[PDB]
Amino acid sequence: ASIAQARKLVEQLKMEANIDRIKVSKAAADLMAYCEAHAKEDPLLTPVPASENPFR
Amino acid sequence: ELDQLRQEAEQLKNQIRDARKACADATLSQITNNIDPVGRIQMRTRRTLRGHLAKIYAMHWGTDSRLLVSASQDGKLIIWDSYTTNKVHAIPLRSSWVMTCAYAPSGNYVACGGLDNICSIYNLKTREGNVRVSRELAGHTGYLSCCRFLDDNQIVTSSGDTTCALWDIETGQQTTTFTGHTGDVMSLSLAPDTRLFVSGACDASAKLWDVREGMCRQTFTGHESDINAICFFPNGNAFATGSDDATCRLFDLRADQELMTYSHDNIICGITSVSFSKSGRLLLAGYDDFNCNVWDALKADRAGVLAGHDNRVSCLGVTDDGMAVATGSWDSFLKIWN
Amino acid sequence: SAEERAALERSKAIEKNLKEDGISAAKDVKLLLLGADNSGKSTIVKQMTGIVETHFTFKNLHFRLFDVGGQRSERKKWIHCFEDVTAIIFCVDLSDHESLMLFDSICNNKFFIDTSIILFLNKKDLFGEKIKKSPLTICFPEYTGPNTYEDAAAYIQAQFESKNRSPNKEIYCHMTCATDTNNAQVIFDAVTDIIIANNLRGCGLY
Amino acid sequence: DHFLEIDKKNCCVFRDDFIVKVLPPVLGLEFIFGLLGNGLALWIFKSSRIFLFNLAVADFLLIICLPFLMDNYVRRWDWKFGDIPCRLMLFMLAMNRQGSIIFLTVVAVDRYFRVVHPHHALNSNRTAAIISCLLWGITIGLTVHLLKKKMPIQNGGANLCSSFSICHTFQWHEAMFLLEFFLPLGIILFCSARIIWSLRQRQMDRHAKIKRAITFIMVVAIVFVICFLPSVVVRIRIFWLLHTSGTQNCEVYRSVDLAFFITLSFTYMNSMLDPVVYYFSSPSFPNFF
Amino acid sequence: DVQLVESGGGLVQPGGSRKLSCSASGFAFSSFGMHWVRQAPEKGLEWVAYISSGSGTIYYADTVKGRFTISRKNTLFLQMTSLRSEDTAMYYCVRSIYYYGSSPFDFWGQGTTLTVSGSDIVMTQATSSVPVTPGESVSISCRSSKSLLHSNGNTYLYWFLQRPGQSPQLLIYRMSNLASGVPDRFSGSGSGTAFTLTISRLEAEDVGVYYCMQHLEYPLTFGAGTKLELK
Ligand SMILES: COC(=O)/C=C/C(=O)O
């Protein structure tokens, strides 16, 4: 009965193996651009002024 | 016949390894080395939501970044008002064992569950003025570990029977079930797209599912021990998984391997909760070492220590607007930090 | 403060309700129950698909008893929920080494290093009947002694004691015949002993 | 030696030479040991825990007041600080002893409740804090009468800054000093006996750590008794002698006054011997050290 | 489901005393603060008193203090002493829960008629009757003497509607939100002092009189009552 789950596992592996992959450097650059593009909208890395901070 | 199938599986795994290695031209560290480090980041205990009388296990921020719901072993799920520390509701749990919490995007429903094998959906805007159970979802043979709402109608729950399922609160039946995991599925995080999610199991692997098709689209490996937390990057193309080996990695969906590893020699306790910031530059990860570290997500170095709890932190939550972060420790004290 | 006064009043009311609930529930004593399958947990539950909670009251103490043996998953990932338990009740079936391994695993866990484990031996009469025909070396090959109840039971006691390593915990072994009603009194006395030991610990004197 | 009048009462007091040759060495030793103990205790620092903290605070205040006593002793009975300093010094000492003794007996009562009657309701932090505040207030209220007294007074080549004078009138202080041993001794003995009986009758006496706990809970009462009995029995001797023979003669009283002061030093050294209750009692504090 | 019934009216001679009982059924009345609102036979609504959950606080109107008493088994009571000539009115029992995001004054009682034989905040309604036809758009505006924009930013302006022969029901609370059970046609606006409830695609069942409330501080004051008649 092991053949059933063996076939399931191997078909899952072969289905996953066909997923297209892009270059790692390009993905890292895109993530860097996204992180840099929202640096001014993050009130954690830049200390929010007490005028706009609701947790006074 | 089984030997041939095992050999084919081994060949497929070797092909996966070769494909993953072939795409790794460089590393994230030597690309981010050109960026100015954030430097020291200091934040103070703005609020302290006193009132709990037991260990706090979860805290999910509402979609309006004001309502926070927390459950404890006392059997109560109090929905706080973070701005003025007011307590709005006190949900009476049927059983004191609770291990998860959730908040509806519209704020109507609050989900809870635990060792009782049952995920309960509460209603906050009932006409009678009191909170009533809308549906007691059952069908899991193991403890529910983390539950999240895709919307007001459907919930996805990660249980302890190596199976994650997509429920239907309207009918109370498993619309779609995701299977394939080996160990306990102790974490879950729906993507901002909400068409896909991940579930970091106890087998030191996080699998990326698809909500609609219900198939394991991609898989990840590399961790040494159990995975206790997971959360997507705000861009939706990456996620960070916190293992129990005192290290948390940042996987990439497109790359299909870990990009940067977050380890340091003075850390020995395993992660308990890991969540990004709004812009994704920081990685506020809770620890079992009495502390709560925040790391630079790019330079992979510490930027500050949020040591303010007298016990291990069991949850971490960042508001949707990024204005505050909440850590719920086992000292019955929930604190809001900015 | 236009209508936030009413919100503060509601917050105060529910805070008082939570305080009253906590005070009421603080008088109960929780005892986690473990053991093998069909190891005598059910008979002692009767004497007094998820987690099963049993509560019985004796001498003005609300004893809460949890049989978590129905959790068909990894014990490591949820054992931290019962970290604040007063005592751990262990049940061993003498009618048949799995229980020994389970006791060894549960005794040295990081979350149970300071909680004393009460060990209850069930089916004493059945074991005494079986030992009259089958030597104790069948179950435990390392045994070497007379084939009688008195020394075989002591040997089992000694081997169960030998599995502990922490010197800050004690094992209150008692033997039950699966039909006596004195188990509740034994449990109450053991709980009182553990409670006063913890109280002496809190004063920095024990 | 001589005689003096005060408080409308033939009131007799001496100044001998052994005092300066006996008291200050043991005084300095007790002071240094007690400061070295209580400074670390306070730095490293529940109902029992807060009671022990309050006892440590009272000990620290007493040992801060003590070097003023050393200065008084070395000057051959000459207080030059003035009226207020002498009044506040007497007030503070008396308050510190009273607080130390009363918090010791409160700690013993807490142990008695936490050993023989574990399920009693008394077994919050706010209630303990308000109880400690009420005890401090009642101590201040009972010791306030010393502040109204006038001191120093000048006879001969000295000023006197004394409250423990061999003096005919029956001051309320004397009754307070008698009571602070009469009642706490009974409470301590009753609590200790009940704790020992309960722990022995529960069969739990086979543990070695239980035996160590028994030895410590006994030695605390032993040190209390051995450090407080001689002072009160000398008080009884003074009362009987003033009684069996009035104050007609003070010639014989010099030796008993010297004994009075050298045994009043036992209270200061009992204060200095606090670390037995704290450190050796539980292994946690050696681990912290 | 929820239903509020009250009784205890009738003809009363002057100088007498009566008891009005508000019976609540179908909801957790223990955690709600029941108000009390009267209506003159030919004028607008007026306030009486308010009792919170657990009777923590109780307030009365200017000409009601001392004469009346409000107390609350799921039953609310109002004690009456020395009824004046103008005390005759129709009395409404109003339920309201107060928390962040709640909907105060959401439901109103049936109402019982009764017959007999300067520093507070005041709000005025510029118009009283405005003819309107179905399918058009109608705008009703009321002004306040004191700005209602509180510190937290929430403006406490409520809009009430009663159809002829019916008890009033909540339409818009806090001048921006919409009460449950109210169609999307109604919409509020305004800020600070000026307010306006805009109605788009008017229906034939929306005719009646509109009353605007403030909740900045007791006593609560009502508008003069803008009546939107057909044609
Ligand atoms: C000379 O010594 C004193 O008078 C002090 C007495 C005391 O308060 O203990």
Numbering used by the authors:
A (entry chain G): 7 to 62
B (entry chain B): 3 to 340
C (entry chain A): 6 to 53, 183 to 230, 245 to 354
D (entry chain D): 8 to 52, 60 to 137, 140 to 305
E (entry chain H): 1 to 72, 76 to 120, 135 to 248
Pull verbatim passages from the article behind this deposition.
The Hydroxycarboxylic acid receptor 2 (HCA2), also known as the niacin receptor or GPR109A, is a prototypical GPCR that plays a central role in the inhibition of lipolytic and atherogenic activities. Upon activation by agonists, GPR109A couples to Gαi sub-family of heterotrimeric G-proteins leading to lowering of cAMP response. Here, we present five different cryo-EM structures of GPR109A-G-protein complexes where the receptor is activated either by niacin, acipimox, MK6892, GSK256073, or MMF. The comparison of the ligand binding pocket in all five structures reveals that R1113.36 forms the most important residue for binding to the negatively charged carboxyl group of ligands, niacin, acipimox, MK6892, GSK256073 and MMF through hydrogen bond.
